[PDB]
């Protein structure tokens, strides 16, 4: 019963913070940037595409923070542990969330109101990183994640008692074990335990996210965006 309540409260936090509705993303699959619109994005300055992408990624991060803040027990952790878990996992969650807005049939992503391929981002000059982000979304797309699966799986991406630097490791372990039981219970109930052998290897998500954040840091160093900072303790760890 506590476990059914936890499934309900994780799914509710996800629903309130998912940013884009799955029904909207699936309906808009036929709404694809024209050749003319793609060329318009490619001709934009590296620095304007950077400003647009940095602002979208900031907002995506801020929704993952509100998601974490609404997870049962997260706000009862010490601030040090909250920041450790968000600093390690918030961008891993953004990259997982991306698969909902990715169409494997044509290798497009929902960006600024329509679907486009990775060639939309040509001006940024990051083709190998962007290709690795699209390939990651392409792998995840094969799971056909349900909304509840993405919610419980992303909760576990964040609530990981193995992150270095935790001060109350036993408190994070308690949350982790309850979220693992919630997730395994839900998969059993839905006859979806077969996704467990297909989830990304932990190291893949960590290295891809580490490369992504390092690229964002390089862009931010060369051309700082102004951030609407909502979570000062976490902002202070990423920006300088």
Ligand X SMILES: CC(C)CCC[C@@H](C)[C@H]1CC[C@H]2[C@@H]3CC=C4C[C@@H](O)CC[C@]4(C)[C@H]3CC[C@]12C
> Taking CB under 6 A as the rule, does residue 215 contact ligand X?
yes
**Token duo for residue 122:** 């040509």
Which of 111, 123, 161, 181: binder of ligand X (CB under 6 A)?
Answer: 111
Find where tokens 């807005």 sit: 101
Q: How far is the CB of 145 from ligand X (least distance, A)?
A: 13
Neighbours of 129 (CB within 10 A): 17
In three-state secondary structure terms, 4 is helix
Q: Does 209 help bind ligand X (rule: CB under 6 A)?
A: no
- Of 91 and 179, the one with the shorter C-beta distance to ligand MJE is 91
Radius of gyration for the alpha carbons in the chain, expressed in angstroms and rounded: 18
Interacting positions 43-62 with ligand X (CB under 6 A): 53, 56-57, 60
CA distance 200 to 209: 13
Residues making contact with ligand MJE (CB under 6 A):
54, 57-58, 61-62, 87, 90-91, 213, 216-217, 220, 225, 227, 229-231, 234-235, 238
- Least Å distance, CB 13 to ligand MJE, is 18
What residues does 110 pair with on adjacent strands? 115
Task: Give residues 60-89 in contact with ligand X (rule: CB under 6 A).
Answer: 60
121 binds, among ligand X, ligand MJE, none (CB under 5 to 8 A by kind): ligand X
> CB-based burial of residue 236 (10 Å sphere; 0-12 exposed, 13-18 middle, 19+ buried)?
exposed
From ligand MJE, ligand X, none, which one binds at residue 230 (CB under 5 to 8 Å depending on kind)?
A: ligand MJE
Among the listed residues 210, 201, 159, the one whose alpha carbon sits nearest the alpha carbon of residue 182: 159
């Amino acid at each position: 019963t506590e476990i059914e309540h936890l499934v309900q409260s994780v799914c509710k936090s996800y629903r309130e913070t998912c940013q884009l509705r799955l029904e909207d993303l699936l309906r808009q699959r036929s709404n694809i940037f024209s050749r003319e619109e793609v060329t318009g994005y490619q001709r934009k300055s590296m620095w304007e595409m950077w400003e647009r992408c940095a602002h979208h990624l900031t907002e995506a991060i801020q929704y993952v923070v509100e998601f974490a803040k609404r997870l049962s027990g997260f706000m009862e952790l010490c601030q040090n542990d909250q920041i450790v878990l968000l600093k390690a996992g918030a961008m891993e969650v953004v990259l997982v969330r991306m698969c909902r807005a990715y169409n494997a049939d044509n290798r497009t992503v929902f960006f600024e109101g329509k679907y486009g391929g990775m060639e939309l981002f040509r001006a940024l000059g990051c083709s190998e990183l962007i290709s690795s982000i699209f390939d990651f979304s392409h792998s995840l797309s094969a799971l056909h994640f349900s909304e509840d699966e993405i919610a419980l799986y992303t909760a576990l991406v964040l609530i990981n008692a193995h992150r270095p630097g935790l001060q109350e490791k036993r408190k994070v372990e308690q949350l982790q074990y309850n979220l693992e039981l919630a997730f395994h219970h839900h998969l059993h109930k839905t006859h979806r335990q077969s996704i467990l052998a297909k989830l990304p290897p932990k190291g893949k998500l960590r290295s891809l996210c580490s490369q992504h954040v390092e690229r964002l840091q390089i862009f931010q160093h060369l051309h700082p965006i102004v951030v609407q900072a909502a979570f000062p303790p976490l902002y202070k760890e990423l920006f300088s």
